[PDB]
Amino acid sequence: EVETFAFQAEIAQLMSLIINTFYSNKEIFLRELISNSSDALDKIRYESLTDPSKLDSGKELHINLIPNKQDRTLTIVDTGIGMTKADLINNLGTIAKSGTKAFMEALQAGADISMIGQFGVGFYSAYLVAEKVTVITKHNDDEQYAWESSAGGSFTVRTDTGEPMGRGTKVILHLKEDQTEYLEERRIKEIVKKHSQFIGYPITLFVE
Amino acid sequence: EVETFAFQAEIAQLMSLIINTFYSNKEIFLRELISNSSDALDKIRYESLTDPSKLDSGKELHINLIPNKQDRTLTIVDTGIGMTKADLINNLGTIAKSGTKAFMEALQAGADISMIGQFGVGFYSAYLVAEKVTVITKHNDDEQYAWESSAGGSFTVRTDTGEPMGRGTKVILHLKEDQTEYLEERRIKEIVKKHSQFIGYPITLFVE
């Protein structure tokens, strides 16, 4: 029922660099995850231009931000293209091996961590705040999967029989104990307004 | 042999806004076209991860910048995924209708033209310097096409029997008479170094 995989060596180093580098500007994780969602929404929209029935699984194109102080999770949900099982395994649809190379040679030439999305690996910036990330996903061409990792070199994949979601991707951030400021309405609002002001899909900040 | 099309009304307004607005920071056209090329190179690279024979049409992943003072053209060539005929017609592979909407509502809320790539329509920033743009393209799944437009509401598409290119996209900028600074080695170098410093594909600036 549960398959366990090793990260390729370069992605493992990336996750370790993100987890271990002292670096105060952690809030960028939210800009990078919203921009990933917006990329995935563009994709299903582009496809729908020539095949309308692609949107049979959900016509609404949006992003929701769901904080939960009980479980200490911040959840980012989008109704984008979603990912097939193969995509989840190939580093959540990214060119993460070459992306990490470029990001590392940029760090060598005086870039800082906030430029991580330039290299196609901004997803891994989740590990600035999250001790565990769970990705639930559904692409039209495949069934619903759950990916999970607490870093340390491996991730799991399983077919997900949780809440049927129609089409898209939920990123569930299980926050580090010292990072619960990102569950605060006010703090989330400020970040979105600061870094994601002109995203072309409605972003709804849920309240508790 | 030559088919002629009308731009959708929103893309037509976008091109007219770009052509007619007084706006001095024109050099951004090069950052936006290099970032489009880099997106297209990511795509063929991602595909090759699961199907290696996708790279049968060219294993090299690069970007070349070719100025020519005789014809007054600056050419951007990439060996990315390239575009099918359908893609050329659907606004060169972009979600240009909704992208223009978002870009326009951003201009209303105090964004400036340099943020155009945030909305998926940075290609049209070519019309800051070019009186005519010619796009030659070859995607693995289709034959080689030429798209052309001098704006004014229409574009052409034809199967291209010019120089067989293997796989990718050439954007040929026929520069406005007052914009030949972009044919200067020194000026091109400065722009690339300023705006495209950390692109993960080698960029070669050709010399004359």
Ligand SMILES: Cc1n[nH]c2cc(O)ccc12
């Ligand atoms: C990767 C990745 N991070 N966040 C995402 C959201 C998506 O909808 C698809 C992929 C990703």
Ligand SMILES: Cc1n[nH]c2cc(O)ccc12
């Ligand atoms: C659109 C567009 N502008 N420049 C490009 C280069 C490409 O390789 C593909 C698409 C575009």
